[PDB]
Nucleic acid binder design. Structure first.
Ligand SMILES: [Zn+2]
Length: 223
DNA sequence: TTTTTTTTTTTTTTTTTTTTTTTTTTTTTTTTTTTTTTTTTTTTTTTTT
């Protein structure tokens, strides 16, 4: 299952310093948690390392829940809990995860590069023939991960008298995909994320930033 | 006219500079085209007393 759900209540109990740090810097703290859990699991099941070589630490019951309309730039790069209704949901897409390239000048397979969520990986030279020239994804030696983009609006009951429901895009990755269906009311925990390529720099108008939530944890509220 | 020292002076290169020649080289935007909606202007089947 490659997914380890850690409650926040008991993490704030046992180790409150981490629980203070985690909302402020969730990317790094979550990377640390993932690697620590991975090696704990390898200690417990040494054979298990052939399976997925990565443990996803999900975090539950994060105390303070901000609703979709109250999200601000104060919340940028922070772990938030919202709640809403899934309105749209792409199919599971295959996203480059550890991507190998072909130098199509000498056919050398450029070594595995980690694909981050906020920047297109582009190699420099190839290490053999030193061509800056064109590369192509080697799709046989690349590994991918499941990617899904959902849209979540505010619950219509939770919307005030004269006001429209606001919606956000969230990104489900690799173990979270297909956990939501349109019309589901979910509790979404994730990083309120700004900095990938969403900035209206293209003279279309104001220099505003589009925002997404890197989902960390999805709780479906139903039977 | 036999012996003998300066003299080049042609041949090896080497330096060595100055000049001309050689070698190298994808990415990123934009745009047309196609296929869609969508409000509006008709126009073609519906029925009555
Ligand atoms: Zn090459």
């Amino acid at each position: 299952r490659e997914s380890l759900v850690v409650n926040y209540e008991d993490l704030a109990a046992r180790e409150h310093v981490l629980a203070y740090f985690l909302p402020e810097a969730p990317a790094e703290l979550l990377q640390i948690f993932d690697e620590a859990a991975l090696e704990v699991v390898l200690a417990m099941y040494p054979k298990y390392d052939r399976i997925t070589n990565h443990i996803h630490v999900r975090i539950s019951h994060l105390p303070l829940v901000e609703e979709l309309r109250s999200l601000r730039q104060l919340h940028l790069n922070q772990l938030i809990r919202t709640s809403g209704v899934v309105t749209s949901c792409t199919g599971v897409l295959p996203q480059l995860s550890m991507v190998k390239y072909n130098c199509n000048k000498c056919n050398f397979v450029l070594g595995p590069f980690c694909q981050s969520q906020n920047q297109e990986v582009k190699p420099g030279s190839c290490p053999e023939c030193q061509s800056a020239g064109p590369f192509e994804v080697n799709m046989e030696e690349t590994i991918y991960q499941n990617y899904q983009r959902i849209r979540i609006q505010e619950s219509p009951g939770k919307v005030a008298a004269g006001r429209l429901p606001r919606s956000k895009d969230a990104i489900l990755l690799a173990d979270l995909v297909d956990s939501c269906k349109p019309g589901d009311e979910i509790e979404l925990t994730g990083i309120y994320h700004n900095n990938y390529d969403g900035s209206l720099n293209t003279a279309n108008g104001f220099p505003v930033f589009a925002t997404v939530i890197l989902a960390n944890h999805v709780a479906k509220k139903d039977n």
